[PDB]
Design an enzyme around this catalytic site. Structure first.
Site, PDB file in Angstrom:
ATOM      1  N   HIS A  16       0.814  -1.212   0.000  1.00 22.52           N
ATOM      2  CA  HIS A  16       0.000   0.000   0.000  1.00 22.52           C
ATOM      3  C   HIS A  16       0.841   1.252   0.000  1.00 22.52           C
ATOM      4  O   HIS A  16       0.417   2.282  -0.533  1.00 22.52           O
ATOM      5  CB  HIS A  16      -0.906   0.054   1.214  1.00 22.52           C
ATOM      6  CG  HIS A  16      -2.044  -0.891   1.148  1.00 22.52           C
ATOM      7  ND1 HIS A  16      -2.916  -1.073   2.197  1.00 22.52           N
ATOM      8  CD2 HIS A  16      -2.450  -1.725   0.166  1.00 22.52           C
ATOM      9  CE1 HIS A  16      -3.820  -1.972   1.858  1.00 22.52           C
ATOM     10  NE2 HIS A  16      -3.566  -2.377   0.626  1.00 22.52           N
ATOM     11  N   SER A  30       0.652  -0.171  -6.372  1.00 25.25           N
ATOM     12  CA  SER A  30       0.359  -1.471  -6.955  1.00 25.25           C
ATOM     13  C   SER A  30       1.038  -1.574  -8.320  1.00 25.25           C
ATOM     14  O   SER A  30       1.907  -0.767  -8.655  1.00 25.25           O
ATOM     15  CB  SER A  30      -1.150  -1.670  -7.020  1.00 25.25           C
ATOM     16  OG  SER A  30      -1.700  -1.611  -5.719  1.00 25.25           O
TER      17      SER A  30
END
Ligand code: HEC
Ligand code: HEM
Ligand code: HEM
Ligand code: HEM
Ligand code: HEM
Ligand code: FES
Lengths: 98, 140, 75, 48, 57, 101, 378, 238, 65, 108
Positions: free
Chosen positions: G200, G204
Site C-alpha cells: 500500500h 500497486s
C-alpha cells in the site's frame, strides 16, 4: 543474567533426561541362518546383525582397495567372514538401507 | 534419399520417439533445398542475399511442416495407443497444412492444405500398412 | 497513498454510461470468441515449445526406465 | 466547446432502452427488478 | 416483464423487506431442493442403498 | 550487411506488441528517479499526448482488446523524444559521481 | 461528516480495503493475493477444529487421526479439507510468486524480501504439519530432512540433536513439531499484514508495467466482487477435490503406522517439495547439496538485483518471456524428477535440469536484458 | 525385478456418483468373519459402525455377542470377559506382532483398516493379488513362500482362500471365485471409507449449487464491471 | 461350482499377441531349460503377457457375476 | 533525512515508542500497561515451552506435567514461571484497572 536465562531455554530444548536412559543390548545368534540380517532396535537406530553368504564373501573379496573413495577392508573391521554387526544407518541421512 | 526415408520408416510407430521428429526435419530440410534449388535456378534473385533468403524460407518452411507432422504423429501414437490407424496421421497432415498456412500468413491456403495433406498422409501410412510397392513390381 | 494527488491531467473527456441501461453480455458469443482466439494466437508460439519438449523428454525418460530395467541378455 | 457529442451506445443498450424516443419511466421497475433479482438469487445461494 | 416490475415494487423496494424476502426464499428452496437432491441420488442408484433392502427385510 | 540488422529490428518491433496498443517507444520506460526527472522536464503538449496514449492503452488492456489494423504506430515514424532528456539526466548523474569521487 | 473517515480503526480499513486506489486493468492473476489470504484463514480454522480433536503422541497419534476421520462427525471433511487446503495454498502461492516474477513487480524491494520470509515460513509450516500424522512416509521424511539439516559441519550436528529433543525421532520431536505447526501461521498472518503494508505504501502494479497512476478506480465495489468470485472458484476446486478424489494428492505410504524398520523405496516427500528435493539429491555432495538448496531459494531472494532491461513488463518482451516459460517447464521437470526413483537416466536429466534452472536465472534473463537494451536503441 | 501393474475394472462404485452395494458389503463382512478374521486384524472399526450400513441393529448385536472379549478389570480387579455388543472393536486374533510374526513364516500380516487406500492401488490390487497365484521359472522358493506376480518380490506367506474354504453363504449365491473375492474387496473398500455414499451425496449437492450459483456471480461481476467495459475516452486540447 | 473367472481366462486368449508372447515365453523357456544353470530365467515375458491376459479378461469379466 | 520518520514500519514505531507525547507528571501507577505487556509475552513464552513438552490426554496429562517437573532441564522453573506469572499478571491487571478508575481515565 540474560545468557543464564538463554542457556536455561537452550538446555530446556536440548534433550530429555529419561531419553538419556539408553542401554546395552544382548543378541542371540543361533536363530540366524545364512544371508539373514536381523534388525534389532537399539538407541532408536537399527541394529543389523547379519549372517552373510559365502558367495557374497566372493563378491566382497572381489571389491578392490584403492579404487574406492574410502578403503576399509572387511578384515580390518569385523572378526568373522560370514558374521557382521552394524548400526543399520546410512551415514548420509540415516535411512534403513534395506 | 533412400537412406533417410528408410530411417524414417524403420522406426516402429510405435514410439521410439524424437528420432521420428529428427528424421522428419531432415526430410523437410532436403525437400526445401531441392525446390529452392530449382527456384534459385529459375528466378535469378539479384541480390544474392535474396537468393539465400528465398532458399532459407523454403527449407525452413518444409522443415517446419516435417517437425509438426512428426510431433503430432508421436503424440497421437502415444495417446491413442493404437498404432495401426491412418487417423492419427490424418491429424498429422491437417496440422502440417495448418502451419503451412500459418507461415505463409493466409488462412484459405491453410484450409485446403489441411484437407489435402491430411488425405495424402492417411493414404501414405495406410499404403504402408497394407503394402503397395514403390513404383513397380516390375515383374508380371 | 491517498486518492486525488496522483497526477495532473488536462484535455481529457471520459464518457461512460450507467450499468442499468446497458446490458449484461453485449455480443458475448459474437466478439468474445474471436477475442479469446486472438489472445491464444498471441502466446502459444512462445508457450508450447517448453511444454512439448518437456513432454518428449518425459516419454523418453519412461522409455529409458523400462528398457534399462528390463534388459533381455544373451544366455 | 459546444461540439461535445456522445458516441452512441446502440451496441450496448438494453432492448427496452434501444428506443431513443419512448420514455424511460415505465421501463424502470422491470429492469431494476431483474438486476436485483439476480443479486437476490446469488444471495440466496450464498446464504444456503 | 411487469411481473418482474411488480416484484420490484413489492419485494425489492425496501431493505429489511428484501432481507426477509431472501430469508423466506432460502428456507423454502433449501427444503424443496434438499428433497429433490436426495431424490436424484436415490434415482441414480435405486438398488444399491441400505434403506430399501433394509425395509424389505 | 546493415540492411539485415534493420530488418531484424523491424520484425522485432512488430512482434513486440506495443504497437498493437497504439503506444510509442518512450512510453514504456521503467521508472527510476532519473526517469521521473525526465518525465518532469517535458514540454507540456507532448506530456499531454503521452498521458492520452497511456490512458487509451490502460483502457484497452482493461478490456483486453487490441486496436484495429489501421491505428498501429508504424515503425520508425514514432517520436524518439525521451533519449535527449533522459540522456542529459544520466549525464548529470555521472557528473555528480565523477565530481564527488 | 462520515464515520468511515473519523473512527480510527475504520481510517486504516478505509484506506486499506475500501478506497484503495488500485489500477484499472487488473487481469486474472492478481486475485491470488486474496486467494492466499482466504486459503490461509481457512487453514487456520480447519486446523483449529483439528487441534480440538487430536492427541499428539507416537503411541496415540495414528489412533487419534483415525478417530477424527471416523467418529467425530464431519471431521473426515475437516481433515481432508486441511490437507487439500495446504495443497491449494501452495498452488496459489506458486502462482502468486510466478506473477510477481513475471510482470516485473519484483522491483518493490522490501515487499519482495518480506515475501521470501513468508515463503520460508509456509515451507516450515507445511513440513511440520506433514510430520504430524505419524505414519511411515511421515517418519522417514522427518528423519531424512533432519539429517539434511545436520549436513552443516561443527554446529549443525549438535543443532540437529537440539531440534530432535532426543537421539532419534522421538515423542519429543512429535510434540515440538505440533507446537510449531500450531504457532507459525499466526506469524504468517502478521507478516502478511506487513507485506500488504509495504505494498500500500509503494503502490500497486498494472499488467503492462506502465506507471498507471492516471486511471485508478477504488477497491470497492469492483475488485471486491472480483475476489469474491475468486473465492468461489477456490471453494469450487477445493470441494471438487475433497469430494471426488481425495487420493489425487494422497500418498499410500502415509496410511500405515510408522514402522521404524521397513522404509519402503517409495520414499518421496510431500509432492510440492519435489521441485527442490530433487536438486538436493542431484549434486553428489552432502554439504554442497544443502547449500545448493538454500542457494536456490536465495536465488529467489536476489532476483531483483539483476533486472537491468529498461521496460519492466514481459508482455512487451518476447525473448525474456521465452526463457521464463522454459523456466516453468524446468521447474515442472524438476518436480517430476523428485517424483521418480533413483537411476542413471533420471540422474542425468535431473543434473541437466538443475543446471538449466540456475542457467536460466543467472545468465539468460540478463543476457536477454542486454540484448533488448541494445536492440531498440535503448 | 518388476512391479506388475494391476488392472482397472468396471466396478460397481467406479463411477464418480455411485454408491456401494450394501448387500455385497454384508456378504463381504460375512467372508471376513469366516476366513479373513484369523490372520489379519481390523481394529479401527467397531460393531456400531455396521448398524446402518449392511446389518440391522439387532442382528449385528447378536453377531457381536457371538465373539467373546476378554474385558479388563472388575470388582476384584483381576479378570473377566464380556459378551460385547456395541462399543466393541473386532478382537485382534494375534495380540503381539511378534506373536503374529511367529505364527507364520515370519512376515506379520498387515492390519486391514486402511488397506484399499494404502497399497499403491485400490481394491484392484487386493483382488488381483488374491486371484493371481501361479508357478515360478526357478526362483529360490524358500519353503513356504508362494509365487504371486502382484507383489513386489512376489514371495507371499499367505495361503489363498481364493476358492479354499467355501463358506456356505447365508443366501444361496454361487460360491465361485470372483464372487467371493470381489465382494470381500468391496467390504474392504467400505472399511477404508465410512463416508463414501454420504460424501458423494454432498458432492452432488455441491455440483448443483455450483451449476446454479456460479454463473449468477459471474453475471453480477460482469454487470458491475460493465461500466468500465463501455467507458470511452476522447482528447480535448485547445 | 465352476467360476466364470477361469471361464473368461480360458475364453479371452483364443488367438492373440498374448498367445504370441506365450510362444516367446516357451522359446526363452527352452533356452533356460536347455542350458544348465546360467543367470537368465525367462520371467519378464511371463509378467508382461499375464498382464496382457488379465487386462483382456478384465474387459469382460463382470458379466455373469 | 531519517529512516525513523519515513520508513513505513518505522513511522508506526515512531508514533508508538519514540515520540508519544506523554504527560510529564505520571508516577509509577502508570507503568502497568507495558508491565502487562511484558507479563503477557512472558506468559506466551512459558506456555509455549510448556506445550512443547506436554501431551493433552487424561491418561497422560498429569504424568506429562510430572515429566516436565522431572526430566525437562529447568522444566520446573518454566512451569512455575507460567503459573506464578499468571498470578502476577492478574495482580497487575487489577492495578491497571484501579488506576484507570481512580485517576479519571474512564472518561475515555
Ligand atoms: C493366514 C494364513 C492368512 C489368512 C487367512 C489371510 N491372510 Fe492375507 N496375509 C497373510 C500374511 C502372513 C501376509 C503377509 C505376507 C505377505 O504380505 O506376503 C498377508 C498379506 C496380505 C495383504 C498384504 C498385501 C500388500 O502388502 O499389499 C493383504 C491385502 C491380505 N493379506 C489380505 C487378506 C484377506 C482379504 C484375507 C481374507 C480372505 C486374507 N488376507 C487371509 C496371511 C493371511
Ligand atoms: C495454525 C493453524 C493450524 C493448525 C492449528 C493446524 C493443525 C493441524 C493439525 C492438527 C494437523 C494434523 C491433522 C492431520 O494431518 O490429519 C495438521 C496437518 C497439516 N497441516 Fe495444519 N494446521 C494449521 C495451519 C496450517 C497451515 C497454514 C498449513 C499450510 C498451508 C498447514 C498444513 C498442514 C499439512 C500439510 C498437514 C498435513 C496434512 C495431512 O497429512 O493429513 N496447516 N495441521
Ligand atoms: C504469505 C503469502 C503471501 C500472501 C498472503 C501475499 C498476499 C499478497 C496480497 C494480498 C497482495 C496484493 C494483491 C494485489 O494487490 O492484487 C500481494 C501482492 C504482492 N505480493 Fe504477496 N503475498 C504472499 C507472498 C508473496 C511472496 C512470496 C512474494 C514474492 C516475494 C510476494 C510478492 C508480491 C508482489 C510483488 C505483490 C505486488 C503485486 C502487484 O502489484 O503486481 N508475495 N501479496
Ligand atoms: C489486556 C490487558 C491490558 C493491557 C495489556 C493494557 C495495556 C494498556 C496500555 C499499554 C496502556 C497505555 C499505557 C498505560 O496507560 O498503562 C493502557 C491504557 C489504558 N487502559 Fe489498558 N490494558 C489492559 C486492560 C485494560 C482494561 C481491562 C481496562 C479497563 C477497561 C483498561 C483501561 C485502560 C485505560 C483507561 C487506559 C488509559 C490510561 C492512561 O493512559 O492514562 N486496560 N492499557
Ligand atoms: C498462548 C500462550 C499460552 C500457552 C501456549 C499456554 C500453555 C499452557 C499449558 C500447556 C498449560 C498447562 C501446563 C500446566 O500448567 O501444568 C497452561 C496452564 C496455565 N496457563 Fe497457560 N498458556 C498460555 C498463555 C497463558 C496466559 C496468557 C495465561 C494467563 C496469564 C496463562 C495461564 C495459565 C494458568 C493459570 C495455567 C494453569 C497453571 C497450573 O495451575 O498448573 N496461560 N498453559
Ligand atoms: S543414501 Fe541418502 S540416506 Fe542412504
Amino acid at each position: 543474567a540474560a545468557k543464564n536465562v538463554v542457556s536455561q531455554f537452550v538446555s530446556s530444548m536440548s534433550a530429555s533426561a529419561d531419553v538419556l536412559a539408553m542401554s546395552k543390548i544382548e543378541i542371540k545368534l543361533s536363530d540366524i541362518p545364512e544371508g539373514k540380517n536381523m534388525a534389532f532396535k537399539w538407541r532408536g537406530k537399527p541394529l543389523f546383525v547379519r549372517h552373510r553368504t559365502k558367495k557374497e564373501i566372493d563378491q566382497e573379496a572381489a571389491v578392490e582397495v584403492s579404487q574406492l573413495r574410502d578403503p576399509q577392508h572387511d578384515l580390518e573391521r569385523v572378526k568373522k567372514p560370514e558374521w557382521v554387526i552394524l548400526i543399520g544407518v546410512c551415514t548420509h541421512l540415516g535411512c534403513v538401507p534395506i | 534419399a533412400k537412406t533417410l526415408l528408410h530411417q524414417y520408416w524403420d522406426i516402429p510407430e510405435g514410439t521410439e520417439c524424437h528420432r521420428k521428429t529428427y528424421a522428419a526435419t531432415s526430410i523437410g530440410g532436403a525437400s526445401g533445398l531441392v525446390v529452392s534449388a530449382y527456384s534459385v535456378a529459375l528466378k535469378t534473385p539479384t541480390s544474392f542475399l535474396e537468393g539465400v533468403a528465398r532458399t532459407g524460407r523454403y527449407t525452413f518452411t518444409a522443415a517446419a511442416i516435417g517437425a509438426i507432422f512428426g510431433l503430432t504423429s508421436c503424440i497421437s501414437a502415444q495417446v491413442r495407443e493404437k498404432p495401426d490407424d491412418p487417423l492419427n496421421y490424418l491429424i498429422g497432415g491437417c496440422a502440417g497444412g495448418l502451419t503451412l498456412g500459418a507461415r505463409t500468413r493466409s488462412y484459405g491456403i491453410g484450409a485446403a492444405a489441411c484437407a489435402y495433406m491430411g488425405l495424402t498422409a492417411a493414404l501414405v501410412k495406410m499404403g504402408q500398412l497394407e503394402g503397395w510397392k514403390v513404383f513397380a513390381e516390375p515383374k508380371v | 497513498r491517498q486518492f486525488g494527488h496522483l497526477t495532473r491531467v488536462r484535455h481529457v473527456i471520459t464518457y461512460s454510461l450507467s450499468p442499468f441501461e446497458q446490458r449484461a453480455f453485449p455480443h458475448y458469443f459474437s466478439k468474445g470468441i474471436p477475442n479469446v482466439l486472438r489472445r491464444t494466437r498471441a502466446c502459444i508460439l512462445r508457450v508450447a515449445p517448453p511444454f512439448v519438449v518437456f513432454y518428449l523428454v518425459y516419454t523418453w525418460g519412461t522409455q529409458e526406465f523400462e528398457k534399462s530395467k528390463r534388459k533381455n541378455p544373451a544366455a | 466547446h459546444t461540439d461535445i457529442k456522445v458516441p452512441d451506445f446502440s451496441d450496448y443498450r438494453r432492448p427496452e432502452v434501444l428506443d431513443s424516443t419512448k420514455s424511460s419511466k415505465e421501463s424502470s421497475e422491470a429492469r431494476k427488478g431483474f438486476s436485483y433479482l439476480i443479486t437476490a438469487t446469488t444471495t440466496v445461494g450464498v446464504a444456503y | 416483464p411487469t411481473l418482474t416490475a411488480r416484484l420490484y415494487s413489492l419485494l425489492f423496494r425496501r431493505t429489511s423487506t428484501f432481507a426477509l424476502t431472501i430469508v423466506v426464499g432460502a428456507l423454502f428452496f433449501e427444503r424443496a431442493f434438499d428433497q429433490g437432491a436426495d431424490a436424484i441420488y436415490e434415482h441414480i442408484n435405486e438398488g444399491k442403498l441400505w434403506k430399501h433392502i433394509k425395509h424389505k427385510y | 550487411s546493415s540492411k539485415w540488422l534493420e530488418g531484424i529490428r523491424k520484425w522485432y518491433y512488430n512482434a513486440a506488441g506495443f504497437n498493437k496498443l497504439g503506444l510509442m517507444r518512450d512510453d514504456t520506460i521503467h521508472e527510476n528517479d532519473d526517469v521521473k526527472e525526465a518525465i518532469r522536464r517535458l514540454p507540456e503538449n507532448l506530456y499531454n499526448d503521452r498521458v492520452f496514449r497511456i490512458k487509451r492503452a490502460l483502457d484497452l488492456s482493461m478490456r483486453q482488446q487490441i486496436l484495429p489494423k489501421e491505428q498501429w504506430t508504424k515503425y520508425e515514424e514514432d517520436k524518439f523524444y525521451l533519449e535527449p532528456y533522459l540522456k542529459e539526466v544520466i549525464r548529470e548523474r555521472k557528473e555528480r559521481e565523477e565530481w564527488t569521487k | 461528516i462520515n464515520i468511515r473517515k473519523t473512527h480510527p480503526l475504520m481510517k486504516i480499513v478505509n484506506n486499506a480495503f475500501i478506497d484503495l486506489p488500485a489500477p484499472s486493468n487488473i487481469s486474472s492473476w492478481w486475485n491470488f493475493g486474496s486467494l492466499l489470504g482466504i486459503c490461509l484463514i481457512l487453514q487456520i480454522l480447519t486446523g483449529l477444529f483439528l487441534a480440538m480433536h487430536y492427541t499428539p503422541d507416537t503411541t496415540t497419534a495414528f489412533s487419534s487421526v483415525t478417530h477424527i476421520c471416523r467418529d467425530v462427525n464431519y471431521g473426515w471433511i475437516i481433515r481432508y479439507m486441511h490437507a487439500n487446503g495446504a495443497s491449494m495454498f501452495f498452488i496459489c502461492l506458486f502462482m502468486h510468486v510466478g506473477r510477481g516474477l513475471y510482470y516485473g513487480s519484483y522491483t518493490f524491494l522490501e515487499t519482495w524480501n518480506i515475501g521470501v520470509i513468508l515463503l520460508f515460513a509456509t515451507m516450515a509450516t507445511a513440513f511440520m504439519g506433514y510430520v504430524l500424522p505419524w505414519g511411515q512416509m511421515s517418519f522417514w521424511g522427518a528423519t531424512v530432512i533432519t539429517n539434511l539439516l545436520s549436513a552443516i559441519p561443527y554446529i549443525g550436528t549438535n543443532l540437529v540433536e537440539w531440534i530432535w529433543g532426543g537421539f532419534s525421532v522421538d515423542k519429543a520431536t512429535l510434540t515440538r513439531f505440533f507446537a510449531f505447526h500450531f504457532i507459525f501461521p499466526f506469524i504468517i498472518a502478521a507478516l502478511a499484514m506487513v507485506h500488504l503494508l509495504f505494498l500500500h505504501e509503494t503502490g500497486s502494479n498494472n499488467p503492462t508495467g506502465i506507471p498507471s497512476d492516471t486511471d485508478k478506480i477504488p477497491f470497492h465495489p469492483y475488485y471486491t466482487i472480483k475476489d469474491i468470485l475468486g473465492a468461489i472458484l477456490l471453494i469450487l476446486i477445493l470441494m471438487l477435490l475433497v469430494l471426488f478424489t481425495p487420493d489425487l494428492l494422497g500418498d499410500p505410504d502415509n496410511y500405515t503406522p510408522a514402522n521404524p524398520l521397513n522404509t519402503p523405496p517409495h520414499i518421496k516427500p510431500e509432492w510440492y517439495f519435489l521441485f527442490a528435493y530433487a536438486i538436493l539429491r542431484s549434486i553428489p555432495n552432502k554439504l554442497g547439496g544443502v547449500l545448493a538448496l538454500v542457494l536456490s531459494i536465495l536465488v529467489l531472494v536476489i532476483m531483483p538485483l539483476l533486472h537491468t532491461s529498461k521496460q519492466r513488463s514481459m508482455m512487451f518482451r518476447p525473448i525474456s518471456q521465452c526463457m521464463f516459460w522454459i523456466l516453468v517447464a524446468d521447474l515442472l521437470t524438476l518436480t517430476w524428477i523428485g517424483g521418480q526413483p533413483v537411476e542413471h537416466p533420471y540422474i542425468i536429466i535431473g543434473q541437466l535440469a538443475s543446471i538449466m534452472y540456475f542457467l536460466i536465472i543467472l545468465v539468460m534473463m540478463p543476457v536477454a536484458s542486454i540484448i533488448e537494451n541494445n536492440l531498440l536503441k535503448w | 525385478d518388476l512391479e506388475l501393474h494391476p488392472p482397472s475394472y468396471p466396478w460397481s462404485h467406479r463411477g464418480l456418483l455411485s454408491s456401494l452395494d450394501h448387500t455385497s458389503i454384508r456378504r463381504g463382512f460375512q467372508v471376513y468373519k469366516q476366513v479373513c478374521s484369523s490372520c489379519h486384524s481390523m481394529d479401527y472399526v467397531a460393531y456400531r459402525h455396521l448398524v446402518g450400513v449392511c446389518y440391522t441393529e439387532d442382528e449385528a448385536k447378536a453377531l457381536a455377542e457371538e465373539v467373546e472379549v476378554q474385558d479388563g478389570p472388575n470388582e476384584d480387579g483381576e479378570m473377566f470377559m464380556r459378551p460385547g455388543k456395541l462399543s466393541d472393536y473386532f478382537p485382534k486374533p494375534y495380540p503381539n506382532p511378534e506373536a503374529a510374526r511367529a505364527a507364520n513364516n515370519g512376515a506379520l500380516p498387515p492390519d486391514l483398516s486402511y488397506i484399499v487406500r494404502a497399497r499403491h492401488g485400490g481394491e484392484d490390487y487386493v483382488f488381483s493379488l488374491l486371484t493371481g497365484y501361479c508357478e515360478p521359472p526357478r526362483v529360490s522358493l524358500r519353503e513356504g513362500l508362494y509365487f504371486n506376480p502382484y507383489f513386489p518380490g512376489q514371495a507371499i506367506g499367505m495361503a489363498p482362500p481364493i476358492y479354499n474354504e467355501v463358506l456356505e453363504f447365508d443366501d444361496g449365491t454361487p460360491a465361485t471365485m470372483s464372487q467371493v473375492a470381489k465382494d470381500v474387496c468391496t467390504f474392504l473398500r467400505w472399511a477404508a471409507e465410512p463416508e463414501h455414499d454420504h460424501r458423494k451425496r454432498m458432492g452432488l449437492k455441491m455440483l448443483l449449487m455450483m451449476g446454479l450459483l456460479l454463473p449468477l456471480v459471474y453475471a453480477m461481476k460482469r454487470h458491475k464491471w460493465s461500466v468500465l467495459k463501455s467507458r470511452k475516452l476522447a482528447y480535448r486540447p485547445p | 461350482l465352476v467360476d466364470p473367472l477361469t471361464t473368461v481366462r480360458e475364453q479371452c486368449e483364443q488367438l492373440e499377441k498374448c498367445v504370441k508372447a506365450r510362444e516367446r515365453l516357451e522359446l526363452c523357456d527352452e533356452r533356460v531349460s536347455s542350458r544348465s544353470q546360467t543367470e537368465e530365467d525367462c520371467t519378464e515375458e511371463l509378467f508382461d503377457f499375464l498382464h496382457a491376459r488379465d487386462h483382456c479378461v478384465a474387459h469382460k469379466l463382470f458379466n455373469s457375476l
